[PDB]
Design a protein around this ligand. Structure first.
Ligand code: HEM
Ligand code: HEM
Ligand SMILES: Cc1cc2nc3c(=O)[nH]c(=O)nc-3n(C[C@@H](O)[C@H](O)[C@@H](O)COP(=O)(O)O)c2cc1C
Ligand SMILES: Cc1cc2nc3c(=O)[nH]c(=O)nc-3n(C[C@@H](O)[C@H](O)[C@@H](O)COP(=O)(O)O)c2cc1C
Ligand SMILES: Cc1cc2nc3c(=O)[nH]c(=O)nc-3n(C[C@@H](O)[C@H](O)[C@@H](O)COP(=O)(O)O)c2cc1C
Ligand SMILES: Cc1cc2nc3c(=O)[nH]c(=O)nc-3n(C[C@@H](O)[C@H](O)[C@@H](O)COP(=O)(O)O)c2cc1C
Lengths: 382, 478, 382, 478
C-alpha cells in the first residue's frame, strides 16, 4: 500500500537502540508502527470485540501481593523444572503461527537462536503451522542445552500427523503440545477486514496418541476445571490453561482466573502432583508471571511479546525480551521476600477481589456533560 | 367538491381539518389521539399535509381508524403554494444530498460488512435525522438501553474441549414451529423511515429468501398493511408473527386479531410494556397517554383475548419474575422479557438479568415447560444469543440491527445480517464445545459476576489532572 | 470581567424558548454559560473534590426498578401530604442562600411566584440567609394555597433568632427546618478561587426550641440513622436526610443510601409513623424522586435545579421546572404500574447492587496506549 | 599535585578514576555500589564530574563512605574543556529558561494556593525533568502509587450532628512527644533537586517556623548532612526523626545511629521495604542490588539494633499484618504501613487497606496498645488523614506534597502546606462532629465498600464507537 516508504524509513534506523527498550510493551509499540497491515492484523488480533484478549491481561490486576519483609534476598533463584527438563527461567516462548510475516528473513529460526544465544535458555514451542520446517528450526538452535517442544495441530488426514509426530521425536523435540481449542480458527476480524486442524478431536484420539509416542503430551487450550481433571484421568503430562490468546471464543474467562479455581480442586482430589498446569495469555510483566507461579502454574507462556520482539529485532530482540522479563521476575522476587520458585506459594497473594470483574452502569451523559470540577492554580500571564 | 380557503380556514388545534391526497378530513377528534403525539398534525393542520402522511402510513389506516363521518369530500385541486407540506425531516437542511452521496454506492459492497455494528455505523451516517433519532433513541437519558447489552458482558463462558464439534445444528422450535435459527426480528414501527420504497416488505423478503429463514414479528404501527408484508413473503415456509397493542375501542382490536389470523400469522405478541409513550428526548429535541394503546389493559383483558383467538398469545414487555409467573398462571403461550428496547421506563433492568432470575424460579415452581420465555434488547453478537439460550430462553430478538441493515441495504442487507449472526452463533457453538441448541445448558456459563452492576465513586479530577502516565519508547525521529 | 458582553448577548435572546427546555439539566447548562463567575461558583460548588456532591446523584443509579405490567394506569395521582398540609407533587423547592446572584431583580420572591403561579403548588423553603426579607418573600406568594417553610440557621445571639421564629410564625410560615449540618460552612473551593450560624447547636437547644413554638420542627442535615433515631426520641416532626448539597463534609454518604438503611430500622423500632423523613441532593429526574419515595421519604427536595431555572427564566423558569419534574414523576408511575404515592412501596425496586460503590484499580496506561481495537466499515472515497 | 591526562586516562568502567572539586578519587570499587546505579558515574568517569556531584550530595559523604586510600591527591588545576561536566539534567534543552520564567514570580502568590494539588501542578511545570521524573515516579507502570490514594476513596463518613464542635483540638502524641498536628513529613532523598539552595534545610525551617510545627523525618540519602538540617531547625520545640537504611558494612550504620542520637533526633525509622531498588521507568526513560542498602537484613538484625540504641525504632515499609505482629513481638516502638510511595514492588496493596485489616487483629491479639502504627502513601486531603486516624493509625505521613511545596515555594511553601492541611483537618473534624483525635474512632466511618477494588471487563469499543449521547439545549447562536 505505498506505506512501505514510511515503514522502512521508521524501521531503518529510527528504531531505538535495543538497549533502550524498557519493557515488553515497547516492542509492541514498535512492531505496530512498522509491520505490514497484513502481519500486525494477523499478530495483534483477537476473536471480535476482543474482550477475553484484554481480559486475560487485566485479570492479573484483580490480584495483589502481600510481600514479606526482612527476609534475606541477596540471592534469588528463578529456575524451575518444566516437563522433565530443568529450565532457567519459569516462562517460555509459546507457539505463534507463521513467524515470517514480521521477520521474513529467518522466521522462527531467529526465535530458536534468541532463546539460546545469551545467558538464558527459554523453552521454544513450535507451531505445526510455523513458516519454517521443524528440521530448520531445531537445527537453528544455538545449544544442546536449550529445550524445544512441539505443538501439534492434528490433521484430518491422520497419517500426515502420524508421520509428523515420529519425525519430530526423531528431530529431538522434548514434548508434544496438542492444541485442542481450535476446532475451527476463531474470527479474527482485524485480518478479515484486509483479506489443517481436524474438528473431530476427542479424548480417545489423545488416548491413542499416548500409546503411539514416548514424548510427554500436554493438552494446550484447556478452559474449565472439568477438562483439567479429564486431562488427568486420561494420563497426559500437562494441561496449558489457555483460550488461545483470546483469539478463539470471545467471552472466555481469563486463564489466571481459571487457575485460581482449578488448583484447589486438584488438591482436594490430590491429583495435583500428577499434572503440570501451565497458563498463558496476557503476561506482559514479571509480576504477572509471579501471580501465575504463586497460584500453581509450573511455567507460564507468552506468544505476542516474543513475536513482536522477533519481528522488530529478530534473534537479538527475542534475547532481549528474555533478559527484560527475567529481570522483572528477579527483582520482584527480592521484593516479594522469596528466593526460589518453590517458595512462591498462594499465601504471598491477596485473592479477595479476584472476582471483582465488573461491568458498569451507563455513564450519565448529561449530568456528566454539564458538570465541571475543581481547577488547579493558574500561573501569572504577567 | 368542497372549496380550499373554507377548508384552510380550519387552521386550528382542537377544531382542526386537513387535506390528505385529495380528500378532506375533519381531524379535530383525532388530533389528541394520534400515535406519535398530536403536535405533528397540529403544526400542519388546515394545510395539505399529504407529504408527511402518504410515505409514512400503513395504507389502510384512514379507512380503518377515521370514522367515516369525519371523512369529508374532495378538495378542489390544490391547496395554494405554501399550503402543501415539505416532507418530514424535521431538522434536516439541503443535507439530503451529502447523505445521498454518502449513500451512493459509497456504501461498502455487502461482502465487506463484518458485523451488525457496521450497519449501525453506516445507517447513522446515511439516515435522515428524524429516522436516526427515531430508530436509535431510548427513553430518557438512556441507561436501560445501553445496559440491555452491557448486561451480557457480565456473563462469561466455560467451554468444553475435545468434543467433536463437526456438524453443528442451530435450529430450534419456537412456539411450535421448527425454525432455522434461534433468533427473530422484533416489531418496529415505521421501517419506511429508513427504507422508504419497501419498508417492512423488504424485511419480509430478506428473512425468507436465503437458505436460512427467520421469523418476522410485524408491528401494529408498521408503515405497511400486514396484508402486503405477508403477501411479499418470498418463501411459503417462513414464519410471521403479529404484535398487537389493544385499542381502547376493543372491537377494533377484535377486528385486528381475526383479520391477521386469516392472513395466517402464527402467533400474537401483545405488547404490554407501553401504556404511556416513553419520553425520547433526542426526538423531542429535534421537533404520552392516547386511546390507541389503551392504558387500562389488565390480566383479565388477556384472559378474554384467549377465548377470542386460536393463535398463541405471548405477552411481550414483561419486567419481573412475578409477571412471568402470573402469565404462566393465566396460561398464555409465552412471555417476552423485554423493556421495549429501553425506550419506555428508564432504569428498568436488563432482560438477561431478569431471565437469570426467573428461570430457576420457573423450574422450582414446576411451570418451566409450560411457558416459552423469549428475551430481546441489547443482542448484537452470536455469543449474546448463546448466553440468552444457555439460560433458558427459547428465542432471542432484535429490533435495531434489522432496521439499520434494512435501511442501508434493503433485503439483501437483512439477509446478510441473518447470515452474519447465524455464522457467529455456529462458530461460537463449536468453540463452546456443543452441537445442538438443546445442548446449550447453564452449566456452560460463568454467572459468578452476573450481578456486578457497579456505579463507581465520582472521582478525582485534580488527582488525575496532575497525574502523568508512563510512556512507550519513541522512534528517533517519528 | 468584560464577559458581561458575552453574557448579555447569550442571555438576551439567544436563550432557547422556555418551551424548549426538556429537563432540569438544560437549565443548568444555560445558567452555566450566562451567570456571573461569582454566582455560578457560589451556586454550583461542592466541598472540594466534590465527590459527595456527584455521589448524591449517581447513588440513584445503583437502584433499578422492577415494574408491574397490565395494571390499570389511565389515572395516576402524585399528591401527598407533607408536614400537616397536603401538597400537590412529592418534591419541594429547597432552601438556596442568596437567590439574587443570578436573579438580581426579584431574588427569592420569583421562586415564591413560580411555585404558585401555575397549576401546581410546590412547597418553598426560605433561607435564614435569603437575599430578600421573609416578609417580602411570603408576601410575593400568588396563593393562600401555596405552602412555605422556614429554615432557620440559629445565631449565636440567640435573641436574634428567637425574635425571628416568632416573626415568621406570625408571617404564617408552615414549619421550621433547623439546618444542623453547617456548624461552619464547608470549603467551596470554586468560590474561594475567585473571592450567622452558631457552632454550638446541640440536641438540648432543639428541645428548648420545641417548647418555644407551635410550628413543626424538622432537623435538616441528618446523616446517619443514629441521629434520625435521636430526632425521634426528642420529638421533632421530621428529619431531612442531607449533607447540604455535598457542600459541607466531602466523603459523606449519599442521602438515598442512608434512607435505604435508616427506614428498616425505623420499622424494627416502630417509630416510623412518628417521623417524616425527607431526602435531598442529586435529584434531577422524576425517577430519582420515585426511587426516594419508594424507599420511604415523605417528600424529596431540590436546591440547584430551581436555583438555575430561576436565575435563567425567573418565576416562569421555576414554574416550568415544576411542570417538567411533575411530568417525569407522572409518566414514570404509569410505567412503574402504580397510581398513588402510597402505592410506591420498596418492592417496586431492585436494591441488590445499592452498595456497588466501587473505586477502580489504576488504568494500565501502557497496555491501554499500545492496544487498538476493532474499526467499523469505511465508506468508499470513490 | 597529580597530573590531568594520567588521571583522564582512567576513563573506563571497572577501573574508573574521577575528579570532584580538586581532589582525585579512584572510583573503581565504588562504581557498582553507588546508590542511584553506577551508570551516572560510568558515563562521566575520567572527567571532572564536580558539576553533578557538588549540588547533589550530603556534603560529608566522600569523607564518610570513600575509604581514604581511594582519596587521591590534587589534580593540577583543571581538566581540559570538555572534561568538566554540564549539570545533571538529563534530557533538558535550553529549557531551563522557559521553566525559569514560568517560575519567575509567575508562580501564583502563596495566598492563592488552595490545596496540596496546586503545589504538584506548579512543580510539574517549573521542575527540571530529572527532578520531576525522580519525585513523581512510581515503580513500574505505577498501579500501587495511584491505588495508595484511590483506596481512601473506598471509605466514606458517618458524621454526627448537633454536637457542639466549637473548639477543635487536632494535637496528638506520636512516639511519646506531643505533636501539634496528626501528620508528619516522610523521608525523601535529594530535596536539592527541586530546592537547590537549601534542600532539606528549608523543610526543617518550614515545619518549625509557624505556630503549628510538624515532625520531620530525615532520609539517609538526603542531600544535606543531618548536622545542618537539625542545626537549621527554627524552633527548639519541633521534632526530627532519622530514617536509616542499614549498610552492608554494619559498623557504618552503627556509627550513623550514635551520631544522629547525639544530634538529638527523636526516633529511628528503619526502612525495610527497599532491599532491591524499585524500577522507575520514567527516570530510566530519561537517562537494583547495592551494598549500601544491605539486602540480607532480617528480624535478628533489628533485635541487635535495639541493644545498640536508646531511641525508639520504627520499622518503616511493612506490607502485611504478619509483619506487624512480628514487629510487635520483637518489641519495636512502631511500624509504618508503607510500600515506599509505590516506587518499590508494584501490585503492593494500599496501606489504608492494610491498616483496616490489621487493627482488629492488633486488638484481638491484645498487642494494640504496644505498637504505634503510622501509614503513608497517597494522603492528599485532610479527610484522608481522618480516615487513617479513625481506623487506628497514630500519625499519617506525606512524601511528595512536601517536596512539591518545598521545591516551588521553599520554607513558606512548606508552612503553607502545613497550614492548608491542618485547616482541612480541623474543618472536617467539625463537620464530622468530633473535637479530639481521640474522638476519631471507627464507628464514624463507612467501611462497607472498603474492599471494592474492581477491574471491570474490557469493553466494547464498537458498541460505544457508534453510540450517540443525549444532548443539552443550545443557545440560538452560540
Ligand atoms: C388520518 C389519521 C391518521 C392515522 C390513522 C395515522 C396513524 C398513525 C399511526 C398508527 C402511526 C405510527 C406512530 C409511530 O411512529 O410511533 C402514525 C405515525 C405518524 N403519523 Fe400518523 N396518522 C394519521 C394522520 C396523520 C397525519 C394527518 C399526519 C401528518 C401530520 C401524520 C403523520 C405521522 C407521522 C410523521 C408519524 C411519525 C412521527 C415521527 O416522525 O416519528 N399522521 N400515524
Ligand atoms: C564519591 C562517592 C559518592 C558518594 C558517597 C555518593 C553518594 C550518593 C548518595 C548516598 C546518593 C543519593 C541517591 C538517590 O538519589 O536515590 C547519591 C545519588 C546520586 N549521586 Fe552520588 N555519590 C558519590 C559519587 C557520585 C559521583 C562521582 C557522581 C557523579 C556522577 C554522583 C552523582 C549522583 C547523582 C546525580 C545522584 C542521583 C541520581 C538521580 O539523578 O536521580 N555521585 N550519591
Ligand atoms: C500471531 C499468533 C498466532 C498464533 N498461532 C498459534 C499456533 O500456531 N498454534 C497454537 O497453538 N497457538 C497459536 N497462538 C497462540 C499461542 O501461542 C498462545 O496462545 C499465545 O499467543 C498466548 O497469548 P499471549 O500472546 O496473549 O500471551 C498464536 C498466537 C498469536 C498471537
Ligand atoms: C424504532 C423502534 C420502534 C419500535 N416499535 C415497537 C413496536 O411497534 N412495537 C413493539 O412492541 N415494540 C417496538 N420496538 C421495540 C421492540 O421490538 C424490541 O424489543 C427491540 O427494539 C429490542 O431492542 P433492540 O432494538 O435493542 O434489540 C421498537 C423498537 C425500535 C427500536
Ligand atoms: C447555592 C446554594 C446555597 C444553599 N444555601 C443553603 C442555605 O441557605 N441553607 C440551607 O440549609 N441550605 C442551603 N443549600 C442547600 C439546600 O437547600 C439543599 O441541600 C440543596 O441544595 C440540595 O442539593 P441539590 O441542589 O443537590 O438537590 C444551598 C444550596 C446551594 C446549592
Ligand atoms: C522522591 C522520593 C524519594 C524517597 N526517598 C525515600 C527515602 O530516602 N527513604 C525512605 O525510607 N523512603 C523514601 N520515600 C518514600 C517515603 O518517604 C514515603 O513513604 C512517601 O513518599 C509516601 O508516599 P507519598 O509520597 O505518596 O506520600 C521517597 C519518596 C519519594 C517520593
Amino acid at each position: 500500500t505505498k506505506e512501505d516508504i514510511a515503514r522502512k524509513e521508521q524501521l531503518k534506523s529510527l528504531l531505538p537502540p535495543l538497549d533502550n527498550i524498557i519493557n515488553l510493551y515497547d516492542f509492541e509499540y514498535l512492531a505496530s508502527q512498522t509491520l505490514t497491515k497484513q502481519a500486525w492484523a494477523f499478530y495483534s488480533s483477537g476473536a471480535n470485540d476482543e474482550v477475553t484478549h484484554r481480559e486475560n491481561h487485566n485479570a492479573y490486576h484483580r490480584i495483589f501481593f502481600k510481600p514479606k519483609i526482612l527476609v534475606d534476598v541477596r540471592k534469588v533463584d528463578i529456575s524451575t523444572d518444566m516437563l522433565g527438563s530443568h529450565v532457567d527461567v519459569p516462562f517460555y516462548v509459546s507457539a505463534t503461527a507463521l513467524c515470517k510475516l514480521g521477520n521474513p528473513l529467518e522466521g522462527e529460526k531467529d526465535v530458536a537462536r534468541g532463546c539460546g544465544q545469551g545467558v538464558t535458555k527459554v523453552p521454544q514451542m513450535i507451531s505445526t503451522l510455523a513458516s519454517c520446517s521443524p528440521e530448520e528450526i531445531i537445527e537453528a538452535a544455538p545449544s544442546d542445552k536449550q529445550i524445544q517442544w512441539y505443538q501439534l495441530y492434528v490433521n484430518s488426514d491422520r497419517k500426515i500427523t502420524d508421520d509428523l509426530v515420529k519425525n519430530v521425536e526423531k528431530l529431538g523435540v522434548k514434548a508434544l503440545f496438542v492444541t485442542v481449542d481450535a476446532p475451527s480458527l476463531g474470527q479474527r476480524e482485524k485480518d478479515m477486514k484486509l483479506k489443517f486442524i481436524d474438528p473431530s478431536l476427542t479424548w480417545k484420539d489423545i488416548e491413542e496418541l499416548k500409546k503411539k509416542t514416548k514424548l510427554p503430551i500436554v493438552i494446550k487450550g484447556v478452559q474449565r476445571t472439568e477438562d483439567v481433571i479429564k486431562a488427568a484421568e486420561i494420563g497426559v503430562s500437562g494441561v496449558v490453561l489457555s483460550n488461545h490468546g483470546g483469539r478463539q471464543l470471545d467471552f472466555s474467562r481469563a486463564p489466571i482466573e481459571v487457575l485460581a479455581e482449578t488448583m484447589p480442586i486438584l488438591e482436594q482430589r490430590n491429583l495435583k502432583d500428577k499434572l503440570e498446569v501451565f497458563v498463558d495469555g496476557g503476561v506482559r510483566r514479571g509480576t504477572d508471571v509471579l501471580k501465575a507461579l504463586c497460584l500453581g502454574a509450573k511455567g507460564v507462556g507468552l506468544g505476542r511479546p516474543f513475536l513482536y520482539a522477533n519481528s522488530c529485532y529478530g534473534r537479538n530482540g527475542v534475547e532481549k525480551a528474555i533478559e527484560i522479563l527475567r529481570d522483572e521476575i528477579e527483582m520482584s522476587m527480592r521484593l516479594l521476600g522469596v528466593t526460589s520458585i518453590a517458595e512462591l506459594k498462594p499465601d504471598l497473594l491477596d485473592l479477595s477481589t479476584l472476582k471483582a470483574r465488573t461491568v458498569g452502569v451507563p455513564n450519565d451523559v448529561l449530568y456528566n456533560e454539564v458538570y465541571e470540577g475543581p481547577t488547579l492554580t493558574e500561573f501569572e500571564d504577567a
